[PDB]
Design a protein around this nucleic acid. Structure first.
Length: 65
DNA sequence: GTCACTACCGGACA
DNA sequence: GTCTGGTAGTGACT
């Protein structure tokens, strides 16, 4: 839940230059897409935030041999 | 206006 | 992938 299923969140802290100490946070989607901002992720979620399930996504069988 | 702070995004790197 | 700086937006205010 806190990080949506299959997504990854990265937090990093800058160590040098004028912005030393500032944090950067970005997310990686289940497909490997990297979002460095809430704006860009929000825009993407408009059309691509839905996930769907089919019966074929669930394997009810045990293989032989 | 300044100031402090947040947020987005491009680009340098070899 | 790693790493940040420039720009812009918000809002309180001696």
């Amino acid at each position: 839940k806190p990080v949506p299923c299959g997504w990854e969140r990265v937090v990093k802290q800058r160590l040098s230059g004028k912005t030393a100490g500032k944090f950067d946070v970005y997310f990686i989607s289940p497909q490997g897409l990297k979002f460095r901002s809430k704006r860009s992720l929000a825009n993407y979620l408009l059309k691509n935030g839905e996930t769907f399930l089919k019966p074929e996504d669930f394997n009810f069988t045990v293989l032989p041999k």
